[PDB]
């Protein structure tokens, strides 16, 4: 055994190399949405036509 | 000539026979309308689907 001392754990070094790049299937902050402006309640829609 | 006197013109006699019957292409007082409840302004509709 050893004393897992206060000053012992060094800061974990992150890898270095090229910059990290996004891989999400859909962007998250920069996206925006073209509203429909509140259709009726009985009118169902096959989604293409609403789009 | 003759004097078209005040008392001369008898009341025109309407014909007599069976009762008069409607022939309009669409009834007029008794009809009613199933509303759509105010759709949007951009959504055009081929009329069957609105009906």
What residues of chain A lie within 8 A of the CB of B36, using their CB? 40
CB distance A18 to B13 below 8 Å = no
In angstroms, the CA B23 to CA B45 distance is 32
B46 — contact with chain A (CB < 8 Å)?
no
3-state secondary structure of B49: helix
Cα-based torsion angle of the residue sequence B37, B39, B41, B44 in order, rounded to the nearest 10 degrees: -130
Q: Residues with Cβ < 8 Å from A41, sequence gap 6 or more? A: B37
Q: What is the experimental resolution, given in Å to one decimal place?
A: 4.2
Q: Residues with Cβ < 8 Å from A44, sequence gap 6 or more? A: none
Number of Cβ within 10 Å of residue A39's Cβ equals: 14
CB distance A37 to B33 below 8 Å = no
What residues of chain A lie within 8 A of the CB of B44, using their CB? none
């Amino acid at each position: 055994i050893e004393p897992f001392l206060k000053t012992t754990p060094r800061p974990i070094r992150l890898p270095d190399g090229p910059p990290c790049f996004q891989r999400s299937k859909f962007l998250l902050m920069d996206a925006l949405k073209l509203s429909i402006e509140d259709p009726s309640h009985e009118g169902e829609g096959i989604p293409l036509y609403d789009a």
